Design a protein around this nucleic acid. Sequence first.
RNA 1: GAAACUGCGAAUGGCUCAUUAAAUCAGUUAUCGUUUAUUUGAUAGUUCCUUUACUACAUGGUAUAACUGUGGUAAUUCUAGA
RNA 2: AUUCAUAAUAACUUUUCGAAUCGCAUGGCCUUGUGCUGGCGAUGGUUCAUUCAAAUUUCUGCCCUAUCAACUUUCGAUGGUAGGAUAGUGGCCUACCAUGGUUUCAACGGGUAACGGGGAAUAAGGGUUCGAUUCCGGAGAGGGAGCCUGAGAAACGGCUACCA
Lengths: 59, 260, 134
Amino acid sequence: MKLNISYPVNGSQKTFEIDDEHRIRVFFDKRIGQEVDGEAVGDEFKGYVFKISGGNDKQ
Amino acid sequence: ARGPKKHLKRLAAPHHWLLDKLSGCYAPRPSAGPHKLRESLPLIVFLRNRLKYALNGREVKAILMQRHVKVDGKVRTDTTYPAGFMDVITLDATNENFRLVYDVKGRFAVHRITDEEASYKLGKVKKVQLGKKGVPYVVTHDGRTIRYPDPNIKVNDTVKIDLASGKITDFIKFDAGKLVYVTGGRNLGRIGTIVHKERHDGGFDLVHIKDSLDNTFVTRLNNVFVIGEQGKPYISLPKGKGIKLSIAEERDRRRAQQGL
Amino acid sequence: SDAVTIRTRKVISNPLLARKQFVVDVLHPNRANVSKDELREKLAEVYKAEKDAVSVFGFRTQFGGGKSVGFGLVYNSVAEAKKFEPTYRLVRYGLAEKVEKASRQQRKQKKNRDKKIFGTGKRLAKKVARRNAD
RNA sequence: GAAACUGCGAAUGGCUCAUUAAAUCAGUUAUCGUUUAUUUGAUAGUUCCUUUACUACAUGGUAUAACUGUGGUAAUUCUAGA
RNA sequence: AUUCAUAAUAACUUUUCGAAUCGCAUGGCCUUGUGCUGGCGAUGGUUCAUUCAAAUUUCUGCCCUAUCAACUUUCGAUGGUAGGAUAGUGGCCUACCAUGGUUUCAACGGGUAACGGGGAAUAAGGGUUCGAUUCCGGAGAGGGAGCCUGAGAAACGGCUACCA
Ligand SMILES: [Mg+2]
Ligand SMILES: [Mg+2]
Ligand SMILES: [Mg+2]
Ligand SMILES: [Mg+2]
Ligand SMILES: [Mg+2]
Ligand SMILES: [Mg+2]
Ligand SMILES: [Mg+2]
Ligand SMILES: [Mg+2]
Ligand SMILES: [Mg+2]
Ligand SMILES: [Mg+2]
Ligand SMILES: [Mg+2]
Ligand SMILES: [Mg+2]
Ligand SMILES: [Mg+2]
Ligand SMILES: [Mg+2]
Ligand SMILES: [Mg+2]
Ligand SMILES: [Mg+2]
Ligand SMILES: [Mg+2]
Ligand SMILES: [Mg+2]
Ligand SMILES: [Mg+2]
Ligand SMILES: [Mg+2]
Ligand SMILES: [Mg+2]
């Protein structure tokens, strides 16, 4: 799925495409608001914490 | 039907306006105001259908938005503003003053009045109540409220009103034998004194009226507007002086003035 | 071209619209109705105000030939005509340009298309430009 | 001066005659039985506080559209995160 | 005609309103503070009045029908008390209580290829027949119900649900 990541300290944004259901799997059952550590998703994201804010499904 | 109605089908217009049958479909609908819908004369009507100053309705807005016309002292810029009986219409340019007052056929007559008389008016007091904080007020037929009237002033008396100021400057009691203008009914327009009042507790006093031709008729109280003394009116009357002639008498007048 | 004769009846000096207004009653023997340009060109040289502040219309010519009756206006200035005259009239004369536009229902259709958009639009141009990849 | 916010209007108008037989409607009443945007005319010296070490009145608070920018869906006057 | 308008006392209130707004002009005044004053009119604001309304409402007046004679209270029918609800009266609704209400002067029921009225057609008169339809009133937006906004809608070129 596609990730829509914003750094709201810099008011920046850019999207990331994650394939591999194993890396994707970290977000499952996590809600909106819940925090998510980064390394799981990518080795770039190590250190980073993500807040889940929303998104869109297919359709 | 869901809300305030906002149009007026020509034909449902009051007749004393003398609008034509065709040429259109609607008549102007009198805005809310000092005078009731059906006993009013919208500015549009006066500026175009009587005075012939405008040809269009479009030119009535044009005349008005330059603040040419002013009613009862104040300017007024509503095309269909409800002018009414006793009100005073003024054109500063053209140096012209008017009072709205009835025919003998029940219509609003074009009546030129002098610049001084053009600065006051008469009001039938319609109710006199004690208002909040103990202040007594009167209310006149054109919906003015006037605080602190004369204690002697009661309902049905007429009242002389400054205009330049809000205040009353004189009043006339509803008595046996006082000049009366009839405002409603068939005898709309007739003028004459008062012979006596029928009482009828619980609905519609009757006022027996005689004019200066020893002719007599009756109306509901409601329709009687005191305006002075036998002789002394407190405003100028239109030519005819509210006397009403038979169709014969009117025929003979009109065919007496015949030789060019 | 046969004397004619322009008569003006029922006349009202109308300050609150800056003009004199009147009936125009034209006798025209042996001349089938006179025309409006002639009537402003002439009435000008009567009411001392010059053509392009004289307005004229109404006008149907009488049954059986001879006469036409219309209506006339003469403004105190050309500044005043150009502002108190109906704009189609100024067009007839040559004092205003017929700024013609889209069909009345072409306009309506543009209004209704425009209702489908919320905001300026150009946001929607770029976003819909991305589509050209999916 | 686009967009957008705010205000007002969209309850008028136009159409039709399915329902409806004491209903509607007409003429005539009543409100000492109520609501009433608007128009018009009136109408407001009082707001704080155990009432000297005193309160923003020379005027107090953010949170949002439009917008910028990152997006989703075959698809609508769909709309999400920043 | 009133327990009316208006006022007075004791308190009450998740305290209503009592201008943190906008446009033109820039002027007076002396103790010289950018002091203190100050013009015309916009928009707003509480209460009362007025105007445009609305909602109920009194009296009388509808076509055919007895092969419709009794009808009304199931699960309000008719009245009384109190409340609740409403903008407000009222069985409008609820609780208690009573047994009332309409009818051959045709109730009740059925039919209507019935919206009502201003009116139309037919010309001795008396009548007979018609009015979906230019104006007034009412009702509806495929059918039913519900409701949001709002002064005003049970709104349909508004929403919600079910049915088609
Ligand atoms: Mg109007
Ligand atoms: Mg009464
Ligand atoms: Mg258009
Ligand atoms: Mg737009
Ligand atoms: Mg309608
Ligand atoms: Mg907040
Ligand atoms: Mg009281
Ligand atoms: Mg100064
Ligand atoms: Mg049978
Ligand atoms: Mg009861
Ligand atoms: Mg019983
Ligand atoms: Mg019978
Ligand atoms: Mg039917
Ligand atoms: Mg019928
Ligand atoms: Mg009909
Ligand atoms: Mg039918
Ligand atoms: Mg409806
Ligand atoms: Mg259909
Ligand atoms: Mg059913
Ligand atoms: Mg509906
Ligand atoms: Mg509609």
